[PDB]
Structure formats: C-alpha cells, structure tokens
Amino acid sequence: GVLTESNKKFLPFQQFGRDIADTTDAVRDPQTLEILDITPCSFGGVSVITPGTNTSNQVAVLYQDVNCTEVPVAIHADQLTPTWRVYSTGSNVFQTRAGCLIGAEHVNNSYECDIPIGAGICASYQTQSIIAYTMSLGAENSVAYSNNSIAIPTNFTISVTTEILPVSMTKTSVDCTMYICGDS
C-alpha cells in the first residue's frame, strides 16, 4: 500500500481503521501512535489505441485509473524492450478523466468520435499522427423560429435505408456424458 499521513481521528486505544468493505484504510504507528492512511498501490488496464494495420502501424497507449506520474515505475520501463520505453515517456502525455494517455497529441478541436476513450474524449488519426480531443455532438444549428414564419418543402426524396436484425443462432447441442467422459 501507500502509507500517507492521515487526517481522521482514531480513538486513543484503537489501532486499525476499516471502511465499508472491511478493508484497512488507516493504520496507527506501533511506536509513535502516528495514524496513517493506507491506499492500495496503483493498478489498472493498458489499452492500445491503433488505426487498422492496413491503414498504419503507429499506436498510442492508455493507462486507466492512474495519475500520469507513476507510469515509468509501474511499467518496468528499464525491464522491457527499448520499444516499450517509447510509450512509458515522451512529450505528448495527456491526462484524461479515464486515466493517462501517452502517445497522442491533445488538440483544441472537435470531430465525430472515432475511437472511444471515455469522459467525452475520443481519439483518431489525422495529419500524420494520433490525436486526442473532446467530441462535438454534431453541427450546431439555430432554426429561424418566428411567430409568423414557417418552412414548407417544395421537393422531396424517396430514400431506402437498410436495417439488419439477427433472427436465429446455430442450434448447437452438446452431449454432457461424452463431452465430460468420452468412452471412459
């Protein structure tokens, strides 16, 4: 865990602190009675954001539930290959609410979401490198409303859209006895 100076108030004799889940969240010093928070060491997933291989071979990596500070220690940068060291550091380290994104250039723009990240952040590949941004929910519009105004079509289009719905699946059946036992 990460023992940090706590601000809570234990009782004089109490030595342990547990949360709703019966997990220790505060500990007291055996010698000096210093009460300290216990926060589990960082952990999380590692996602690789990549345009299709038939499109490109660059990647950008995301670490969920981390402040960007602990990526170099947590990833074992010194232990992995020199290629992994590229995504353990760099200048383009952008922090989102989803975690820390290393390898994408945060921009001040908005487009359709292309590869989801989280908390409104979506990333894509345009000139020629990987970018990250905040999505725009379609073009803005102000309709010319007026107390004596209308809009009436004078032409029309006959469109044909396509909808697909799954109807059935394979009627697979497994023999429990022969599967578990075979001829035995």
């Binding site: 004596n148 029309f156 859209t161 396509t162 697909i164 799954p166 394979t170 497994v174 599967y179 035995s184």
Partner: protein, 205 residues
C-alpha cells in the same frame, strides 16, 4: 455493414472453442486425459484425480450453457422485434416515427440473410424548402376562417392555402376552409378575401 449477424456468429463460435479448450485443462489434476490418469494410476487415487477433473469440466459446460441461455434470450428479443417490423412495415404502412426507417414511412421490402433478416425501408423525405409568412386564421366578414386540410401561407402579397408537407398553394375558397367564430378572439388573424365559387357564377347567370 452486417455487424449484428457477424457478432452473433462470432460469439457463438467463440465460447464454443473455449469449452473445447477447457477439455485440455488439468483443473489441478495430474493430466487432462482421463485415459492417462487411468493407465498410470491405481483406482484408489485415479478416482480422486478424475473426480477433480469432472468437477472442473462440469463447471465449464454449465458456464457455457448459461451463457448460451442468455444469448438465446437476446436473439429472441431481436427476432420478436423483427417479426413486429415485418408485420408493421412490410404488411402495412407505419405511422410510428423511427420504427420503419428514418423519415415518413411508405413501405418496406424484406430480405433474408444467414441467421437473420434485412429490411429495406422506403421512406419519403422532404427536400427543398422555402420560408413563408403564415397566419392561424383569415378574417373575411367578421368571422374567423381556418383551413380544413392545410396551412395559410403567403408568397409575400398573396395569401394562399397549402398542405403541410408539399408546397402547392391554392386559392382560398370556402371549400378548402371552414368558418368558426369571429375575427376578435383568434390571435395573429390576418385579413384577406375568401372567394366563394358561387357569386361570380351567379353574376354570370
């Protein structure tokens, strides 16, 4: 474009390979071949080993059966929606918005696909519009007039009446309108003439 069908087929094939892959897992036994534990061990201990393997395989098969039992419900819900769509878009015209396609629905044509269906919704979409002045009513003789099957629009000087979805302006007669009340209660009423088809003819005859 066939993402839904492919997802169903893949999810079925996968997880059917997971079950078979589990067939080569020890589950903490000495070997994942029942014959081998039998031909390398005496029954007093081969019994315990096979018992462990049976428990693991039973868990794996039960998990696969439960997952399939939930995916079957999902496909049932999809097929019930598709049967409803077939009935209410193919066998008739729907006034449900965004049910049979996006737009004013006209008809549909069904097509089949492996383990599924594909619908072609033919819809009517307005294309080119103008903007016109309008009014809730028209005052002619101290009586409020309203349209029967249309709205009152102006080309800037001439008040006309037209249907609400295609600009076809026609002369405001007492036939394509109807009188109700006076010109004092309506709000935004305008002044124009409701031509009666009778009096010009009467003057003619």
């Amino acid at each position: 474009a066939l993402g839904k069908l492919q997802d169903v087929v893949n999810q079925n094939a996968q997880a059917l390979n997971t079950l078979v892959k589990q067939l080569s897992s020890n589950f903490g036994a000495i070997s994942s071949v029942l014959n081998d534990i039998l031909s390398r061990l005496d029954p007093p201990e081969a019994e315990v080993q096979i018992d462990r393997l049976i428990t693991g395989r039973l868990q794996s098969l039960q998990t696969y059966v439960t997952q399939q039992l939930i995916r079957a419900a999902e496909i049932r819900a999809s097929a019930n929606l598709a049967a409803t769509k077939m009935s209410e878009c193919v066998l008739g015209q729907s006034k449900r918005v965004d049910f049979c396609g996006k737009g004013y629905h006209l008809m549909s044509f069904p097509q089949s696909a492996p383990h599924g269906v594909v619908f072609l919704h033919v819809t009517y979409v307005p294309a080119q519009e103008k903007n016109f002045t309008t009014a809730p009513a028209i005052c002619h003789d101290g009586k409020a007039h309203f349209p029967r099957e249309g709205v009152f629009v102006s080309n800037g000087t001439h008040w006309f009446v037209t249907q609400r979805n295609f600009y076809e302006p026609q002369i405001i007669t007492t036939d394509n309108t109807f009188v109700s009340g006076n010109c004092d209660v309506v709000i935004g009423i305008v002044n124009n003439t409701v031509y009666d088809p009778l009096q010009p003819e009467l003057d003619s005859f």
